[PDB]
Amino acid sequence: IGTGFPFDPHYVEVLGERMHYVDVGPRDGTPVLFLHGNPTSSYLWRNIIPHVAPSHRCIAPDLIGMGKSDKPDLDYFFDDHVRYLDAFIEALGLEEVVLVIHDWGSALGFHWAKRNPERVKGIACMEFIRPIPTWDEFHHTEVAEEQDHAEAARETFQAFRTADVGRELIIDQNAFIERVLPGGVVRPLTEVEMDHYREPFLKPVDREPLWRFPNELPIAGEPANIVALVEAYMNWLHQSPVPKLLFWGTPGALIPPAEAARLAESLPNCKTVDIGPGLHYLQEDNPDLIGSEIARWLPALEHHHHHH
Numbered sequence: 001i002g003t004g005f006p007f008d009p010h011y012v013e014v015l016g017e018r019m020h021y022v023d024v025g026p027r028d029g030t031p032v033l034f035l036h037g038n039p040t041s042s043y044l045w046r047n048i049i050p051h052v053a054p055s056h057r058c059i060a061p062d063l064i065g066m067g068k069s070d071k072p073d074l075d076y077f078f079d080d081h082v083r084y085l086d087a088f089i090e091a092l093g094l095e096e097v098v099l100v101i102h103d104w105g106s107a108l109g110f111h112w113a114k115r116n117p118e119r120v121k122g123i124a125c126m127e128f129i130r131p132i133p134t135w136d137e138f139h140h141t142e143v144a145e146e147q148d149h150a151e152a153a154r155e156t157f158q159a160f161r162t163a164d165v166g167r168e169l170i171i172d173q174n175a176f177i178e179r180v181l182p183g184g185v186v187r188p189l190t191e192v193e194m195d196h197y198r199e200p201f202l203k204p205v206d207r208e209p210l211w212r213f214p215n216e217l218p219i220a221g222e223p224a225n226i227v228a229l230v231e232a233y234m235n236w237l238h239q240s241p242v243p244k245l246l247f248w249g250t251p252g253a254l255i256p257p258a259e260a261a262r263l264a265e266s267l268p269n270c271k272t273v274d275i276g277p278g279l280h281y282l283q284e285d286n287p288d289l290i291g292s293e294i295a296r297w298l299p300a301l302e303h304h305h306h307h308h
């Protein structure tokens, strides 16, 4: 699996700050917008984009306070991210797009789509965020062998959301980067890959977005604004005719194989793709199948639409 990041560095001004993004692919192509989550960057998509770029424009921003984007004095709430990515999209003059999304990138992407449904020609998603009404639903599974792992996951994120303790882990010990990220890849990440992921967060104080994110997860009614927002987009998604492509792995994390199977029915016009062994950061386990299946699925999205 490729460890390099060979893309031209692009930057654009957004709400006064700079945001870094990948922009490859023919300039005249329907754009495909790749949205990473916690605690990743555009690096997450490095081995997926080359499958899509021969035919389409590939745009992959680093969220504010992450990757090579600027680091304003914010608390990095989800709404902060909403503001910057909304302005990013308009700053590139994008009209209609295809979304490719993960984790908090999926919350952002789905929220954007629901508010801008006529501008989304398709959604490729994987290990995405859903309402979590109870902790038992978090990493829920009915596969006996996976139960111990699932309860460990609960404990982990309960701690992240525990006052002072959470900050200790994520801010002082860099747990999201040194433990959660490699912990959510089946194959071993290399030093080179880890170093790419560590680069934006060498200073602990810069780790704030990595702590706020788990504290923004819509679990057991809190935080209420996010619970509402996530319920809204999921209702939207369940009712939308927009073409969907869903990647999943075994045993998965947020999305277990059994639910992936259900989403194949509960989500209209949904093709599913088993990437084989996977945990949360599926992109690092089978980037080639994710990029090739996205590429195979993009042409038909032009149907019923036109550029002229």
Ligand SMILES: [Cl-]
Binding pocket: 038, 213, 214, 215, 217
């Ligand atoms: Cl998180």
